[PDB]
């Protein structure tokens, strides 16, 4: 019977971790400077190679 509880524990922690990912996604979206610096970085990369 102990093995049965093992599966339940994995599901319980899995749901808790899922909610944590949503909070971090908000920050990314809400962040302006992060996106701005990231955007710029990419552009220069291709120009140097071309």
């Amino acid at each position: 019977e102990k093995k049965v509880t093992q599966s339940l524990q994995t599901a319980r922690v899995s749901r808790r971790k899922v909610a944590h990912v949503l909070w971090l996604k908000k920050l990314q979206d809400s962040s302006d400077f992060l996106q701005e610096q990231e955007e710029a970085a990419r552009g220069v990369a291709a120009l140097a190679r071309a």
């Binding site: 019977e1 093995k3 049965v4 509880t5 093992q6 599966s7 339940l8």
Partner: peptide
Amino acid sequence: LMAMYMALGAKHPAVQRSR
């Protein structure tokens, strides 16, 4: 026997009946 309960989960009807 223990390798089957986790394979089909704990909430599975058949697993519950067999348990």
